[PDB]
Design a protein around this ligand. Structure first.
Ligand SMILES: O=C(Nc1ccc(Oc2ccc(C(=O)O)c(C(=O)O)c2)c(NC(=O)c2cccc([N+](=O)[O-])c2)c1)c1cccc([N+](=O)[O-])c1
Ligand SMILES: O=C(Nc1ccc(Oc2ccc(C(=O)O)c(C(=O)O)c2)c(NC(=O)c2cccc([N+](=O)[O-])c2)c1)c1cccc([N+](=O)[O-])c1
Lengths: 813, 813
């Protein structure tokens, strides 16, 4: 209690407030939960606390949205298929300053609030960084006083819960709404119809899309509290409902309603399923009618010219790019605007964000698919293309190949639509997510596009919110910082720079290292308690957490681990810094290699964690079911953060940033925002290793030959042989043959080309660790220069150079 | 307002109470509904009122159930697949005395409570009288202070909403939970597993039912407020949940969970679908584990002898008869009691109620069905049979045919299990639902059973609650009665007898006729408003409301109607009492004749309601979507109640009783409880017509010949010819050919044998109507002797002669 108390960044536990809090809790438990302390379960406790928290939101929520209604600002909609929201109770107490009062309140009712908090389900409505980006962004736009709205799908089931079984992943259904959701509010009043299939008739009005199937979109609003400023914004998620023999028709209502059933769990990967495209059409069509409906109920042919003055639609990826042809659909067919005015309007409303350079991430929908589901949209996409391509022709006369290259229509055996091309055509702005990425789009992927309309293209380096990702998750760190520099930094992270004044302050040095070791013990107790996993709290915590993928080179990490192990066994008496190597993250079901790689990790620990010579010198664990809430625990405890993807394949990354905020040192490549983080801190304060992008490209120019590295490196040859022969899986010697063959003959990610430098760099890291003070002073240097990686920074830029709106930090009443 | 005020049976609108009520409403609208009066919709108003009402229940609910816990009475469980609950808000205000306060409260917030009330969805969780019986019974057991629990299934969709289209029924999905349900409380804490399929292994423990599929049963408790006595009992309804490629497995969770999706809409009819048997297994298995679990957490080999001292399980029909072999399943396999002790226990816990003599109503499950779904239950049913049949043998030595007749095993092409036989074998008591019915079971259907174990067999004449079915629905009638005799009658309906003192009281005569005419104008405004149906308020309201069936002889009614019409056209100048003939009720989808008959009704009105000669003399309407809530409106407005089924086919009826309570005169046959209602009132005060049961039987002895009546009755011949030739459906002359052929060659219900007497009796009815005073004095006689048809009477009998518990009317604190 005393620590929780002590922490000033957590607010006042005022006498009347704690008296009221406790009162509202009893009352909720009696009326809402229909309970007494004899029969309440912990879960009732949770729900009793959650209702009391949420009651603090309502008045603000009601009034913020009344204010938008009254004032009619320009409105920002953030359209995404994913909001990686994680839990909400701590979060709302944070931004409402209620955390220490609620803490005192509950203690006094004989209840540990942390314990109640662990009852809450995450809203795991995303797959990895774009989804989580989306959630960080709602928070910053709230904190920036913007008239912003998140728009997505209320899935039944979010990302699958991961169970490791026998060292393999087992997917279970994430039934996060089993017990209901105190956070959401049903909005029946705003249910809309969405039309699927049917056909198009050209009449004297124009076109008319007839004989369609109808699914209803039912919205559920969720409050988005800003930091301590009396703003509460909404996320609105749509859920599919069937319109209003005999038994079999009712049972078959499930078919329409399966559109919001389940997040597709393919991160960084296009699988072209029709159910996925219905998901995408669903959210798009409902959001844009709701949008056009608000526009209609606000100011005032007057109207639609001004529509881009009144509306911004941000496309998170190409997942809601049907926004473009739908907007046009409405304007042209329904509103009867002329094609050219309607196109002017669209391009002024819409901007697109790219998250990936990987070609296997791009959405390219078979036209037959689109032609059946969405006959009218296809026609509009053809008209869009034609006229766009007439523009390329005019600018590059005779450049026929360029026509073929820029076309939204991919020729082939299967015709398909390039959803990225679509998006660049129909948006006034196209961004990447970090300085290098946005250069490569301009230099490569969208090079011809850039030449056309160079003013379209921008950079918006990612951030993370310093509420969830420092104040919530690392209240310790948060508190020793506020102690020196006060509390303003929490929504002005650039204030962190002030901590460079403390690099040679003995109490600061001491406190920082104290806080991390405090977090290491907590994490280590979590592992015992929840998973009976025993780890060394006096070791280097080396963490790689992120979805499992080949580009991400969990495999290069595993080679480092087996090197460490093999060196020990060679010189057993020789000293080494003790490590706990933690690898966590989910594989897409059906990503065979990624599932292979999880299995190899746990296989490495089966060996490594049982060698008596090794003892407590090295330990390998796979952290089960990595999610937002799990992030919030292991990130504040890590010493080293692994950011090891091949140069040029991680667009930005954001995990990098969370680990920076919270006092880990980074081993990485110059990739994504790792480059800007090295810039911030100075490269003298990072562990940058291996190829730059230019060295990958030179490798590709002449040919990656994995065997060249094999033949030259006896250490890498010892491990390959281990893997082949069955050292890591004796009961099935041939188990890792597809890992080996990929590494040997088909590695698109060049793992062996970065091997020798990664291991030498890891040498450097452990040398620094053997001097605590100097570790802690470089850490200081890292924390101190992470303020650029706040999402307030990122969002203020989107507002000023895309949405064409001014941010704010003036408190509402 | 002034009438609503005036009504003393509706309680006090105390100054502080109205101040608190209004306060809790605002507060609910703010916190629960997240609203202001600018944005609230009516539906929010509703939900704001409902939350405030329900808050008055909670403390009582908590404490009533604490009291059962503390005291550990013997417990009554009422197992039914159906609870025809209808709406709840008015009902709870009634039994809590809050109706006039809530009335004043809302008025003062500028809201009409009646209007809010019309927003509520019925819980249409039943098909007709057994389902509704079930709901009347929860109410009486509450009012009688019994430790009773309703146990059923929380369907997704209750009985289909009926739409009449072109004069046909159209079924729509009753999505009654769309907007959620303020009345229910989720009980995750008491989720149980139910096992389907699998197989049986006989080991050294005994039998063991292995490799099963698991569905979870999730309970939702609903409060059952007693009348003004501070008892709140629970109805617990179970909802199916799936246990805790990749996408297609999540989507396929619907398959397990489709067990609670939808009420099967077959009233008075066995269709032998496996999904239906899963429904039946579901509710049974979950309820009995919950039951055996309570028994285990209460008093104390000690235990299970006393289990029938501590448990009563009432079987509403044979729908939960799997209760028997399941109870045994548990006792034998799980608890390891010996077969003979376990059988003693079962028979002492279980009693069965029969609702039907019709053979097409009986559940007779193919064994292969049972053998697959429920291998172990089948084995136990075989063992049960064997030993039961060994008992028949011993009592009737050599009577081989009797063996075959009594067997739970039906031989044939398809083997099947007789669920009724099952039930008589495994229950200590078997009842019918009205004096005549229970004689016929003893004399016919269960004759051999009766000879075996004559002490098994009982009668429990049905009732209806005089809260829903007078105080709620006819507050007028309720108020003029209380004016004379005070308010005690409401839970002592036998007090009504006191009104015979008023048969020659001019003010009483006047007030009764006033109240009915008041209800006639209201109903008539409902029809205009909600359905734009214009009716004559100065006519005789002749109502037949009940599910559509051949036994029920909606068709004999239609013949009366076309007689009336044809007589007018014959003598147009001749005076007749003006009628509005209202026929309402649903057909089972797939019951072809019943759907034909709806169509004939509306076809009759197409003719009849457009003949200018007829004018406002006769009008025929089909009342759409008959349900509990609709009952509550048209019953208080009817003059004549039609109870015209063939003698011996309506087991009891309860609609008869509602119309009696509320001041309609009855035309009927001596069938079901019509006979006891004629007894109560004296036959001089009823319109009894046609065959007695003995005259049906004599008809069957020699042969029903429909053509005999045709040849003898020129009036019935004029109509048959109308129907054939296409008078009622000129655009399709042949439309009613299957009605005609059934009437001519296959009428199991002898419509023509009752024709001449029904029409003459209808002559009598209209003669009486032409003298208002004398109508009103016979009505007085009817209201005055309906107290026997209260369900308090019925339930006190079940308690004393079945459950072996004393009723009570002492108020809880
Ligand atoms: O304008 C007034 N009130 C209001 C007015 C408006 C809104 O919010 C609002 C309503 C409708 C629309 C729209 O047309 O799209 C928008 C918008 O333009 O974005 C915003 C209010 N707050 C809410 O309705 C609200 C906010 C948050 C959550 C919920 N919810 O879960 O339902 C509801 C309260 C007002 C003006 C004057 C007097 C009163 N009053 O006394 O009640 C009220
Ligand atoms: O026994 C005590 N309290 C209690 C004890 C028990 C019950 O109800 C109850 C609990 C469990 C069981 C059971 O084992 O099956 C039964 C039963 O035997 O039937 C009844 C109470 N009331 C409720 O739990 C209740 C009632 C109605 C609705 C809900 N609901 O929706 O969740 C809950 C309150 C008690 C005793 C002493 C002190 C306190 N206290 O101070 O809190 C409480």
């Amino acid at each position: 209690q005393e620590k929780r108390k002590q922490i000033s960044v957590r607010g006042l536990a005022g006498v009347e407030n704690v008296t009221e809090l406790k009162k509202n809790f009893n009352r909720h438990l009696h009326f809402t939960l229909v309970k007494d302390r004899n029969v309440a379960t912990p879960r009732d406790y949770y729900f009793a606390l959650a209702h009391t928290v949420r009651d603090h939101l309502v008045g603000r929520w009601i009034r913020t949205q009344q204010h938008y209604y009254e004032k009619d600002p320009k409105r920002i909609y953030y359209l995404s298929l994913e909001f990686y929201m994680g839990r909400t109770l701590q979060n709302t107490m944070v931004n409402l300053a209620l955390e220490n009062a609620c803490d005192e309140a509950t203690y006094q009712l004989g209840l540990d609030m942390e314990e109640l908090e662990e009852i809450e389900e995450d809203a795991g409505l995303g797959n990895g960084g774009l989804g989580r980006l989306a959630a960080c962004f709602l928070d910053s736009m709230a904190t920036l006083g913007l008239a912003a709205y998140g728009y997505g799908i209320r899935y039944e089931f979010g990302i699958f819960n991961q169970k490791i079984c026998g060292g393999w992943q087992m997917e279970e259904a994430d039934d996060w709404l089993r017990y209901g959701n105190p956070w959401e509010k049903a909005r029946p009043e705003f249910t809309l119809p969405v039309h699927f299939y049917g056909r198009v008739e050209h009449t004297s009005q124009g076109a008319k899309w007839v004989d369609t199937q109808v699914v209803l979109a039912m919205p559920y609003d969720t409050p988005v509290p800003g930091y301590r400023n009396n703003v509460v914004n909404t996320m609105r998620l749509w859920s599919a409902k069937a319109p209003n023999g005999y038994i079999q028709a009712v049972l078959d209502r499930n078919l329409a309603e399966n559109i919001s059933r389940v997040l597709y769990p393919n991160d960084n990967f296009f699988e072209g399923k029709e159910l996925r495209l219905k998901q995408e059409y669903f959210v798009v069509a409902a959001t844009l009618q709701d949008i056009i409906r608000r526009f209609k109920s606000s100011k005032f042919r007057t109207n639609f010219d001004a529509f881009p003055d009144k509306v911004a639609i941000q496309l998170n990826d190409t997942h809601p790019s049907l926004a473009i042809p739908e907007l046009m659909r409405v304007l042209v067919d329904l509103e009867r605007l002329d094609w050219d005015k309607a196109w002017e309007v669209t391009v002024k409303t819409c901007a697109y964000t790219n998250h990936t350079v990987i070609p296997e991430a791009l959405e390219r929908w078979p036209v037959h698919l689109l032609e059946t589901l969405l006959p009218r949209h296809l026609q509009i996409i053809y008209e869009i293309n034609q006229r766009f391509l007439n523009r390329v022709a005019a600018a590059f006369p005779g450049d026929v190949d360029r026509l073929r290259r820029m076309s939204l229509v991919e020729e082939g055996a299967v015709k398909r639509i390039n959803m990225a091309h679509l998006c660049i055509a129909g948006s006034h702005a196209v961004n990447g997510v970090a300085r290098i990425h946005s250069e490569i789009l301009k230099k490569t992927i969208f090079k011809d596009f850039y030449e056309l309309e160079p003013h379209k293209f921008q950079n918006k380096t990612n951030g993370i919110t310093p509420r969830r990702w420092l104040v919530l998750c690392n209240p310790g760190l948060a508190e020793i910082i506020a102690e020196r520099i006060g509390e303003e930094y929490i929504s002005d992270l650039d204030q962190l720079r002030k901590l460079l004044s403390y690099v040679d302050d003995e109490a600061f040095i001491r406190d920082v290292a104290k806080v991390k070791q405090e977090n290491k013990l907590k994490f280590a107790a979590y592992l015992e308690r929840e998973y009976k996993v025993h780890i060394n709290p006096n070791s280097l915590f080396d963490v790689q957490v992120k979805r499992i993928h080949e580009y991400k080179r969990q495999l290069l990490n595993c080679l480092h681990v087996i090197t460490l192990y093999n060196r020990i066994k060679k010189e057993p008496n020789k000293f080494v810094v003790p490590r706990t190597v933690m690898i966590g993250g989910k594989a897409a079901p059906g990503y065979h290699m990624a599932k292979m790689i999880i299995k190899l990790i746990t296989a490495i620990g089966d060996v490594v964690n049982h060698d008596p010579v090794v003892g407590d010198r090295l330990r390998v664990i796979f952290l089960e079911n990595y999610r937002v809430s799990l992030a919030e625990k292991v990130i504040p405890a890590a010493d080293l953060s692994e950011q090891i993807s091949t140069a040029g394949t991680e667009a930005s990354g954001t995990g990098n940033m969370k680990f920076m905020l919270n006092g880990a040192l980074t081993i990485g490549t110059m990739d994504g925002a790792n480059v800007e983080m090295a810039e911030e801190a100075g490269e003298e304060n990072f562990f940058i290793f291996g190829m730059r992008v230019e060295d990958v490209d030179r490798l590709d120019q002449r040919g990656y030959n994995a065997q060249e590295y094999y033949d030259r490196i006896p250490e890498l040859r010892q491990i390959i042989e281990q893997l082949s022969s069955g050292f890591f899986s004796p009961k099935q010697p041939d188990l890792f043959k597809d890992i080996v063959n990929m590494l040997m003959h088909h590695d698109r990610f060049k793992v062996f080309a970065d091997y020798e430098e990664y291991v030498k760099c890891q040498e450097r890291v452990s040398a620094l660790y053997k001097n605590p003070r100097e570790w802690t002073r470089m850490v200081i240097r890292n924390i101190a220069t992470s303020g650029k990686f706040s999402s307030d920074r990122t969002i203020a830029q989107y507002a000023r150079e895309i949405w064409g709106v001014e941010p704010s930090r003036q408190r509402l009443p």
